[PDB]
């Protein structure tokens, strides 16, 4: 399978399946014209998804509640397992998939000064310089990939066609 | 680091 997701600031599209609510940037930075500010909407371009499932995310510094980087699909320590880091790691969610710039224009965006991008399934209505997606995305990802046998290639193209706020309504409702 | 948490 080869899947080129698209993200327009409010919706993550899986062609042939459907649409997922999605959000990028901290509360005041959810704007295409702020995409080179740290923790703002992710820069436009092409990114590879690392969907290999690798279990729990590494913990770079538990004392500082600092998760390490990892190039795959990993889970977030939460609840009692996270201890006092729960409040911080709720901003990750329960799942994260690493992204990496995949071509020249994307690697050179913003002078190359931004990075550490992921798709993750927190329900905050914001993201610390990443893409927060409706949690069902990860259930569909698991179900679709576990019924295929060969190589599985996932990318996402980020393209803002509107100046509207890059918030897809992912904050937990009612 | 790109992130502190
Ligand atoms: C230290 S790189 C800037 C912060 C990172 N989270 C980003 O949004 O690109």
- Residue A113 CB: number of other CB atoms within 10 A? 9
Atom of ligand 1 nearest to the CA of B1: 1
Q: Is the CB of A129 under 6 A from ligand 1?
A: yes
Tokens of A11: 């919706």
Domains of chain A (ranges, CATH numbers): 2-158 (2.40.440)
Resolution, Å (one decimal): 1.6
Nearest partner of A92 among A110, A119, A111, A112, judged by Cα: A119
Experimental technique: X-ray
**Pairwise CA distance, residues A19 & A15, whole Å:** 8
Write a three-state SS string for chain A: CEEEEEECCCEEEECCCEEEEEEECCCCCCCHHHCCCCCCCCCCEEEEEECCEEEECCEEECCCCEECCCCCEEECCCHHHHHHHHHHHCCCCCEEEEEEECCHHHHHHHHHCCCCCEEECCCCCCCCCCEEECCHHHHHHHHHHCCCCCCCEEEEEECCCCCCCCCCCCCCCC
CA of A40 from ligand 1 middle (Å) equals 8
Residues of B with CB under 8 A from a CB of A: 1-5
Tokens of A133: 């997606």
- Residue B4 CB: number of other CB atoms within 10 A? 11
Q: Do B2 and A64 touch (CB under 8 A)?
A: no
Angle (nearest 5°) at CA A124 between A107 and A70: 40
């Amino acid at each position: 399978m080869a899947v080129r997701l698209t993200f327009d600031g409010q919706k993550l599209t899986w062609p042939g399946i459907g649409i997922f609510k999605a959000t990028t940037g901290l509360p005041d930075l959810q704007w295409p014209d702020k995409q080179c500010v740290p923790d703002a909407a992710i820069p436009e371009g092409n990114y590879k998804l690392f969907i290999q499932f690798q279990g729990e995310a590494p913990i770079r510094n538990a004392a500082d509640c600092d998760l390490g980087p990892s190039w795959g699909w990993s889970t977030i320590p939460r609840g009692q397992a996270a201890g006092t880091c729960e409040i911080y790691w709720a901003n990750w969610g329960y799942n994260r998939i690493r992204l990496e710039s995949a071509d020249e224009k994307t690697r050179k965006a913003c002078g190359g000064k931004r990075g550490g991008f992921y798709i993750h399934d927190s329900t905050k209505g914001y993201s610390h310089g990443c893409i927060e997606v409706e949690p069902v995305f990860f259930r569909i990802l698991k179900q679709e990939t576990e019924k295929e046998n060969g190589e599985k290639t996932f990318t996402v193209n980020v393209k803002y066609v509107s100046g509207q706020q890059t918030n897809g309504g992912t904050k937990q409702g009612e | 680091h790109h992130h502190h948490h």
